[PDB]
């Protein structure tokens, strides 16, 4: 292979791997922030569905 081919192929390889490395560091930072704060789509541990609540007038009024 030519030095041109090896050179520019090395540049493409280095671009792809540097971009994957930056995305891995961002993935770690996103995971840390979403576990700490809990406002992302991840770490959403379930709560009680409020569709289960009965809203009818009950037997006694004070409720």
């Amino acid at each position: 292979d030519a030095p041109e081919k090896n050179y520019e192929r090395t540049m493409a390889i280095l671009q792809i791997e540097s971009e994957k490395a930056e995305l891995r560091l961002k993935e770690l930072e996103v995971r840390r922030l979403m576990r700490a704060k809990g406002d992302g789509p991840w770490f959403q541990y379930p709560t009680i569905d409020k569709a289960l609540i009965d809203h009818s007038p009950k037997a006694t009024p004070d409720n």
Binding site: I16, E19, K20, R24, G40
Partner: protein
Amino acid sequence: GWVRPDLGELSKVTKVKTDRPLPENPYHSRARPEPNPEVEGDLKPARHGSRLFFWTM
């Protein structure tokens, strides 16, 4: 002149005309927390695949 109610009448659900206002917050609930954001957008492929150490897909 009073008539005794028939079997079934004193258990009817009746409508009441009131002048007092309807209670707007009878449970005295405070402001609800704002929800988490929904997901939006089109689903693009993963940038350079799985990014698991060397797996290029």
